Design a protein around this ligand. Sequence first.
Ligand SMILES: [Mg+2]
Ligand SMILES: [Mg+2]
Ligand SMILES: [Mg+2]
Length: 34
Amino acid sequence: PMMLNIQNMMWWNGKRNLYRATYREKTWYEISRT
RNA sequence: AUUUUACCAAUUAAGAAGAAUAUUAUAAUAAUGGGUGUCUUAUAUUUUAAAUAAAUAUUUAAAUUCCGUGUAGUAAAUUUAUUA
Ligand SMILES: [Mg+2]
Ligand SMILES: [Mg+2]
Ligand SMILES: [Mg+2]
């Protein structure tokens, strides 16, 4: 698969990536706030 | 004695519940997939993985670089919160 630049989003097309966390405690933007 | 030639002109008041828990945004308190005329059991009713996503970010510098596609907490549970 390699999911090369595929816009897989639930609200966009109803499909989510196979390898990802179903829950995230802090969004990536919150982690960047060093 | 019967006896009126041919052609030439115009859309205007609308009578009636035959108009509404009506359309579209707006509610930051709920949420296990809604299916009524339904209704026995489930060896037959199981979807999960550290990445940009139904979670969406207050600047104009420098700087990698052969059109620089770029800005960092404002508060540490603090009052921008996905509401019916
Ligand atoms: Mg005339
Ligand atoms: Mg009428
Ligand atoms: Mg709630």
